[PDB]
């Protein structure tokens, strides 16, 4: 899991 | 009421994916995001709307789709959707280059500067983060 | 009649306003995943609204971050959706 | 047991568009909240809340529009503006 | 489950901040009509089997110890929360009698790691007050  | 279909078109499905951005900006990758494009196109496509996508859209270039759109005649149209995939912050959406208000955006199909759509939904998907709280959760039952 | 310029926008934001959106790896991201699932299983049946609902019920549960970044593990998210629509909004003409 | 977002469930029903005037008449009160109660009365034991705040949205966009001896004020118009959190539907009557 | 439960003993409580005068020096013209307005919110939600309390004439201070005492309250026995705010506002921000308020902070002393027993539980917030101070011209359909 990442972020924008 | 309910918006009414009783068109010959659901209307067009305008959606901007952006994956790769200016090194300038130090924004990393958003891998996946072909992923998230290519399922909200099939979705919509299904429903009957015309699905465009364009791809790592720089925030001019964004604002001359858009302006293009809401400048078109969508009098056989019922309604416009548009998906938004990239980063973002409070209230801004990353084209490729730098950022742009959201406001900027999507005030160009507003009632009085987009007559086409008038009485029609604009719906707009927002992918992209609006800040950097994280939410830590809570537990429930 | 005269409308207000502003009716009729629906704003579906992935996330709260001043809030991170997560993404992962390469399955897409958890707003737009949970979108077009509940698009494909609701568009001909509820509203809009309605399935939106159902959206920030599948981001809110069935995600929660993994994370080696300090500070970024095991996080939640919930979207936020802005209605200035004045009508119920179906994607088909009979909802079945 | 499950987690959830701390942020979750919430319903922020704004009488306005971020950025624009909100409108009131000294006599009947606000031209959102009058509304809200009206339709509140007629479908709150049987709509979800927000249906409900769907046709405050309509009522509120039809049937005002300003009136100001200030003409730079005059023929106005008010959308509300409804911001959902909300997982689950609410109806207020099981 | 796709309804939040109302199998509570109480639907909840309702608080109204009903502000009509300000202070003067701040250059904000009172609310006149604005305890109609509390009043029919009341009625509507008094029927609805909510405990309703009204405040009226509240400064930026005197609304957090209100709600602040709420979020710290136990709800239990309560199906959902209710707040309706009723003053001037500006964009992002709520005025007391005095001065203004982020609407940040008042919305999240009832978060869900801040208000333990609200949580899973419907938090509604009806907001009259200006966000700004443009003015929608309308466009005829």
Redesign the interface.
């Known amino acids: 899991?990442?972020?924008? | 009421?309910?918006?009414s279909?009783?068109y010959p078109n659901?209307g067009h499905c305008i959606i901007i994916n952006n994956k790769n951005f200016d090194r300038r900006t130090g924004m990393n990758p958003?891998?996946?995001?072909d992923?998230?494009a290519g399922?909200?196109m099939?979705?919509?496509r299904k429903?009957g709307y015309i699905v465009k996508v364009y791809n790592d859209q720089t925030v001019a270039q964004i604002m001359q789709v858009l302006t293009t759109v809401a400048h078109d005649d969508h009098s056989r149209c019922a309604?416009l959707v548009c998906?938004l995939?990239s980063h973002?912050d409070?209230?801004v959406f990353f084209g490729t280059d730098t950022s742009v208000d959201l406001k900027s955006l999507?005030s160009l199909?507003?009632?009085?500067?987009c007559p086409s759509?008038?009485?029609?939904?604009?719906?707009?998907?927002?992918?992209?983060?609006?800040?950097?709280?994280?939410?830590?959760?809570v537990e429930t039952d | 009649?005269?409308?207000?310029?502003?009716?009729?926008?629906?704003?579906?934001?992935?996330?709260?306003?001043?809030?991170?959106?997560?993404?992962?790896?390469?399955?897409?991201?958890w707003?737009?995943?949970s979108?077009?699932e509940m698009?494909?299983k609701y568009?001909?049946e509820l509203?809009?609204?309605?399935i939106?609902?159902?959206v920030?019920?599948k981001v809110?549960?069935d995600f929660?971050?993994?994370?080696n970044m300090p500070?970024?593990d095991?996080?939640?998210?919930?979207?936020?959706?802005?209605?200035?629509?004045?009508?119920?909004?179906?994607?088909?003409?009979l909802e079945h």
């Open positions: 899991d990442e972020v924008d | 009421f309910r918006y279909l009783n659901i958003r891998n996946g995001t992923v998230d399922n909200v099939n979705v919509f429903l309604s998906v995939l973002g409070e209230g999507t199909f507003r009632g009085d500067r759509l008038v009485g029609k939904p604009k719906l707009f998907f927002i992918q992209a983060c609006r800040g950097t709280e994280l939410d830590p959760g | 009649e005269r409308i207000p310029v502003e009716a009729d926008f629906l704003y579906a934001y992935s996330t709260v306003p001043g809030y991170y959106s997560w993404r992962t790896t390469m399955t897409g991201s707003f737009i995943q979108l077009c698009m494909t568009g001909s509203e809009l609204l309605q939106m609902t159902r920030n019920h809110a549960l929660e971050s993994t994370s500070g970024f095991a996080k939640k998210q919930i979207p936020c959706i802005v209605s200035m629509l004045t009508k119920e909004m179906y994607f088909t003409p």
